[PDB]
């Protein structure tokens, strides 16, 4: 009956944020919790990307990896696929990584993170309120769907 995996509750591990996010936190998976509509990102094995409020889904355990400075490659653990944004706006995942699998990460002044697309820095990643994936064409500033809260599953 224990909700979620190893519990969670609001916390703040490593309070030494005197800079940004140097290499030292991409060793454990990270749950992407969307503050808009409260929805956790979840990559299905079929590639279909969709968010869900069921934190008891071991499919939301995405393995992130820091590549260059500010660049971070996302990867699915159970899905075993790298997220990829198409050119029209359809988001999907594949076993082979590509140049569209990168996402410029940027932390704002609100403890909220923001993943911006690379091959398309003119659009950010954001889900809908019904748990569906918002087209990368309707995404943009003004919408708070960009306020993500990737919590590391340390403990």
Residue 36 annotated as part of some ligand binding site? yes
Q: What is the CATH number of the domain that holds 138?
A: 2.80.10.50
- Total domains in the chain come to 1
Give the C-alpha separation, 42 to 50, whole Å.
6
* Method used to obtain the model: NMR
Cβ–Cβ under 8 Å, residues 30 and 150: yes
Q: Which residues pair with 33 in a beta bridge?
A: 40, 149
Q: Which residues contact 146 (CB under 8 A, 6 or more apart)?
A: 112, 114, 115, 124, 125, 126, 139
Q: Which residues contact 120 (CB under 8 A, 6 or more apart)?
A: 85, 87, 136
Helix/strand/coil for 93:
strand
Helix/strand/coil for 101:
helix
> Residue 33 belongs to what domain range?
1-155
């Amino acid at each position: 009956m224990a909700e979620g995996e190893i519990t969670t509750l609001p916390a703040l591990p490593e309070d030494g944020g005197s800079g940004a996010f140097p290499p030292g936190h991409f060793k454990d998976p990270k749950r992407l919790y969307c503050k808009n509509g409260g929805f956790f990102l979840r990559i299905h094995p079929d590639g279909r990307v969709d968010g869900v409020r069921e934190k008891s889904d071991p499919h939301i355990k995405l393995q992130l990896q820091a590549e260059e400075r500010g660049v971070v490659s996302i990867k699915g653990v159970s899905a075993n696929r790298y997220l990829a944004m198409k050119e029209d706006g359809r988001l999907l995942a594949s076993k082979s990584v590509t140049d569209e699998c990168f996402f410029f990460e940027r932390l704002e002044s609100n403890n909220y993170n923001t993943y911006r697309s690379r091959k398309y820095t003119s659009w950010y990643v954001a889900l809908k309120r019904t748990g569906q994936y918002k087209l990368g064409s309707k995404t943009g500033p003004g919408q708070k769907a960009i306020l993500f809260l990737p919590m590391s599953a340390k403990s």
